[PDB]
Amino acid sequence: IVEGSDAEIGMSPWQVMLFRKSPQELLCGASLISDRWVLTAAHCLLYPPWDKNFTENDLLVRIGKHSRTRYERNIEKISMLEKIYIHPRYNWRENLDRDIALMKLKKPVAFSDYIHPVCLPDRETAASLLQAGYKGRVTGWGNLKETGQPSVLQVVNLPIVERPVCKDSTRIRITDNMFCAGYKPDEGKRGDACEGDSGGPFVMKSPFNNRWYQMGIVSWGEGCDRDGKYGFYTHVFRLKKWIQKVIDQFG
């Protein structure tokens, strides 16, 4: 995250770190959506241009974390993957369209002050909240600038940007399964996701029921925090049908 701040303890208790077993390192962000399902970006697991293609036994999920590097004894919980599900129409060849994947855990995780799931939007919360100018929040342990690493989880609030501005900021083909967020050069403020923040959540707090909803997944950006550029997020509600099919079939 660049130009963000240290998270508060328990601020993002749905935050998940995807961790490589060997060499031991941060792979991506992710989010907890039930006691045994974790949501992330497909590109976190499968991205052939970079020779990335992870299997279940290659990874772990670390839940409840705050510090990036430390093992947070008595707080974090570390989980093995039962199975990975990638969207069957994920477009890694061109523009990361449908950049979403589910991970089912070997055993349920115990909720705690630091571990709790986020909500996924229904059609009405999505229609109400996904409006240009409305702000969401992105969290992660990824780079602090385009090119240090943070000591702890970073947080940044960013406004949703109008679709024509998103489209005009890039030569990549944008789809209805994405939205973009960030400040414009004239808005003063800045901030963005960056490398390592992939797969983490873009969340919003509904003013109707005061619950946090995950509206987006950190997906792609040209550089990080560049003027006139925006971060792009997977539109979770648009892929809701797929998410429910998976959970309803593989439970």
Binding site: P23, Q24, E25, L26, L60, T69, R70, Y71, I78, M80, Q149
Partner: peptide
């Protein structure tokens, strides 16, 4: 590398 080692159990 830079990460504190995790418990062998996992």
């Amino acid at each position: 590398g830079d990460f504190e080692e995790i418990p062998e159990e996992y």
